[PDB]
Amino acid sequence: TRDETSIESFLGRSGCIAMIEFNTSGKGFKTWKVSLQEMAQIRRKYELFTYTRFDSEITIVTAAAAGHIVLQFMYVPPGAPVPEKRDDYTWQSGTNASVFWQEGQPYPRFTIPFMSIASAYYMFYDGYDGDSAASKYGSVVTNDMGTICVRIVTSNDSNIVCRIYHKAKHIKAWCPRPPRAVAYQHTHSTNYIP
Amino acid sequence: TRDETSIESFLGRSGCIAMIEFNTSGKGFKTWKVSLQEMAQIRRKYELFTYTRFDSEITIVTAAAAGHIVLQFMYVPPGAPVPEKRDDYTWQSGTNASVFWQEGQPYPRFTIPFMSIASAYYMFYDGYDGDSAASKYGSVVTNDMGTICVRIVTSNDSNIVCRIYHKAKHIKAWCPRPPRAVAYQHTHSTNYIP
Amino acid sequence: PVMLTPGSGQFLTTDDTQSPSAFPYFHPTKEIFIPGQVRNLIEMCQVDTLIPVNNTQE
Amino acid sequence: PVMLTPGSGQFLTTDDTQSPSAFPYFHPTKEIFIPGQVRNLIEMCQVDTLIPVNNTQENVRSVNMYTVDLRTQVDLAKEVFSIPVDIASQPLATTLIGELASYYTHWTGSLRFSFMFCGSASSTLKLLIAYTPPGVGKPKSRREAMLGTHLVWDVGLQSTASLVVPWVSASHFRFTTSAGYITCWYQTNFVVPDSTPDNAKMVCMVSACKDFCLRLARDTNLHT
Amino acid sequence: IQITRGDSTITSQDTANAVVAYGVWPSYLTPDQPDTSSNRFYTLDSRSWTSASSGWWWKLPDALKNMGIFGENMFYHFLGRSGYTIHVQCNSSKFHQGLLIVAAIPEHQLASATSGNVSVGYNHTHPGEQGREVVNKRPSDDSWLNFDGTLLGNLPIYPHQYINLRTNNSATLILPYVNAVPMDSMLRHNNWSLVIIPICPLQVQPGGTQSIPITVSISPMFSEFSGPRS
Amino acid sequence: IQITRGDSTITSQDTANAVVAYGVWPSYLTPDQPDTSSNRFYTLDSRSWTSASSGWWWKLPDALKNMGIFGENMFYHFLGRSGYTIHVQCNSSKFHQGLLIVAAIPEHQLASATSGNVSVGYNHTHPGEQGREVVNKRPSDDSWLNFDGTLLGNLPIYPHQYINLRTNNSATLILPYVNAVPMDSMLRHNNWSLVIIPICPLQVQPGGTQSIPITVSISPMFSEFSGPRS
């Protein structure tokens, strides 16, 4: 009994953390910097803790509307260069992880390791990127988790939507915190005023 | 010999307990509250007993008519919020079980555990939801089994029919009852008058 | 190295495969003792029930 | 020679298969010791957190929601406070245990309620703290509360009192959306010497006991 | 012989010939209790069985809600649990004849006397110690359909005994607690219904007593309650 | 009794009743150190608690950056690490009343007093030994929202003690080093915030002292530094 209140049960359930959409007719690619802060319901559960550490399993559910479409999904790890164009050199780099997926095949899945240079992710961070009045404060300073990039490989009028399902695995969590009592206004910020 | 009259043999055969249908052109989703009372032939066999306990295996046979369609089938457990709209927050909740299925793939299958807060389902219940003259009587009071929800994930004129096949598993049954002698009039009710 | 065989991907309605639990981590409510468990219908067949011998329209 | 079976190629969102590492050869940063690891949420439920008992429109934007007034200038026949014991509803719903229970459909086990008197060392008073079981109906008077399960608490002698409400329902769990009432009554007037405040505040707290359990997780708009 | 429970005593020689429902003796709840002050025989007002009678029913614990310590315990606790001994006696001459089935039905969810999806109302399903003597939210009168759409000839699948007036003047049912939860609301829900139906109607010649009394005595057994209140 | 660390001495009988944050005693970093010249008690200027007070906070190590050898070590090394003993004393008569919560919050990332995505500025999050006494880049004043959008009634989830003026005049927190890296910039980042909030406001009758002093004494514990420079 009480395994359903284990941290693996509470934080380790798959959820749609991002919603990549793009069109084709540059243009035919999209990118998303990976964070758990986008969706309030996911964010609130992770923010019950000060630090968390997990590997993460990505599953990408794709729907498309105008032969079968071919997509490249690319994971760019922290501090590596992110694509600027649909056929940039970054898509060919053997240091990025790519999965090529073709329509009607089972949805693509991969696990990213815990990538951070610190031993856990900071859900909160009481410090700065530097000394300046312009310097960032809070959990945006730490926690580059990488970027998910999508392009169509096929030659040509179509709309593509990719739901990024994420499951945290082998989860550890430290220093419990009061639950968020008021609405989230912005990503990584503790600000609450409407 | 006589395993074919075991309760697992008698109650544990797969049958089409529900027939979800919807159209797309809100609108592009449908829901069905799970019960064994919809189909008289299924209902009569379970109502030979006062209490039953089982896990249940759901298999969803889908046909559709105007690329390959993508559907999300979602199990909402007892007491969780059911979808009000095609892109409501409830479809993204990691506490619901979802299977994404795409046309021509083998039909989706999952087992729901025995979900009830009581130790068995009440086939009959000689009691009320409360003290009032408006209070419900009978096996509708107990036995929320959850809700099956369906939406199209694809962007756009189509008609979809989903046959919900259900097999009870690891079945236990208690307190045998006379067979139903007269027609069923309504779900959960013992009423018989035309 | 595998070959699928002609039964592959069928939904045979009488099949008996394993399937994934929709809800791992969930523990079902404990099975208490309830009197009068039935394991086989032949237990019910062994009970004496009245024959409606006097079948007339009145 | 294999057959795929009807589950094959599904994305069931609750599945637990292996999957390929996107980055073999990469070794993650070593896990150092960090104080305060949490392994189960029931560790957090066991912490005493303040009940916002004083829910009135003047107090709910402030620290004053947590403090119950005790005073000389009062109708001594009226209740001091009452708390419904269901963690599903006000005032318990925004406590840490009410918040953690809101992520689950079902709860069970014992609740510890604690009361702390914050008057001066020269202030003395008796309070009657009563528990009324579910379905019995909230006491209308100090005499009716005294005929039930109660503590006569002398706040002069003891600055803290506690009550453990054990699990009492027909099923081993109940839904997170009665458990009875805790009610507080004046047993005496508020007694002070000269040059002492003729009023004080009391703080109410709640936590789980070691038997507490939550079941069937759910996500819902109880936070937007 | 004599049977005594609490300060109550009843006389019957048949007591060893009781039917134990499902072969399970009543018991206190296992680790995974007021005794004899609660667990008396309460004897209801006797029914008049006549050649015109369609049968009778009572719901348990509802028939005992006004009955002494047990009836008070049903209001003064949130949840409860009990088994029962039901003793039915039916005194007659050697010149009377008739057959009763005495049956206990678990979860006897009544059908209405009406064609809609309308439920049976709380006032009708909770008749108390008087029961219902069978003649828009009222229950079925069809004793031949067990008031629930099932045939009377199949009623013996439930815990039952016959009273055949030539053979035996009494029946005894021992009922364990039967529910899908360990304890439940004694006022919102009835675990058992006692049903008494004449299969062969009473016959006697004129100058014999035209009504014979059916006397029902019910004792709670292993009664347990939780959530006490004053 | 008397507590002595380095050339500093403080008096309090309550010292054995300290809360050890997360049950972990402070320690030197394991193989997978200036001692008592650094590890003195530094006593801050006492706060005036009044019936009007909303509470106070300090950030650590920031509150010690000007404090003797430890404050110099924060500028003369690139990376640092320490635990703390925080001793809070609050001297009062038997005729005063009030309740403080004294809490230590790890990574207390402040919300702004404003509606935009605008961060709290470095000048505001690094107040030094004076702390902030609570009243467009300034932090929240909502002590009832923990300055971070979380309820004050839930603040006890952090390492904390109460000061209830009738019972105890003091609180002691022992804080281990808490971070996701072994050592960090002592000037860019604060491991802990000390928060003192009146739950029950101060009351005393006229002719009593209307302000009571809250005295905060902080000792570094097991302090370690790396990358030394002159």
Residue numbers in the entry:
A (entry chain A), B (entry chain A): 64 to 88, 98 to 138, 144 to 233, 237 to 274
C (entry chain C): 3 to 60
D (entry chain C): 3 to 179, 185 to 231
E (entry chain B), F (entry chain B): 14 to 45, 55 to 157, 165 to 259
What does the paper say about this structure?
Rhinoviruses (RVs) are the main cause of the common cold. Belonging to the large family Picornaviridae, the typical architecture of RVs comprises a ~ 30 nm diameter capsid enclosing a ss(+) RNA genome of about 7200 bases. The building blocks are four capsid proteins (VPs) present as 60 copies each and arranged on a pseudo T = 3 lattice. After the first 3Dstructures of RV-B146 as well as of the closely related poliovirus type 17 had been solved, high-resolution X-ray and cryo-electron microscopy (cryo-EM) structures of numerous RV types and of closely related members of the Enterovirus genus became available and have been used for the design of capsid-binding compounds. These drug candidates attach inside a hydrophobic pocket mainly contributed by amino acid residues of VP1 and displace a natural pocket factor—in most cases a myristate—stabilizing the viral shell against structural changes required for release of the viral RNA genome into the host cell’s cytosol for infection.
During 2D classification of the extracted particle images we also noted that about 20% of the particles represented empty capsids. Following the infection and virus purification protocol, we usually found empty particles in the range of a low two-digit percentage of total viral particles. For completeness, we also analyzed the structure of the reconstructed empty capsid (the B particle); it also exhibits an empty and collapsed hydrophobic pocket missing the myristate; similarly to the native empty structure, residue VP1-Met222 reaches into the pocket. This agrees with previously published structural data of uncoated particles. Finally, based upon our structural data we conclude that incubation of RV-A89 with DMSO elutes the myristate from the hydrophobic pocket and renders the conformation of the pocket more like the pocket of the uncoated virion.
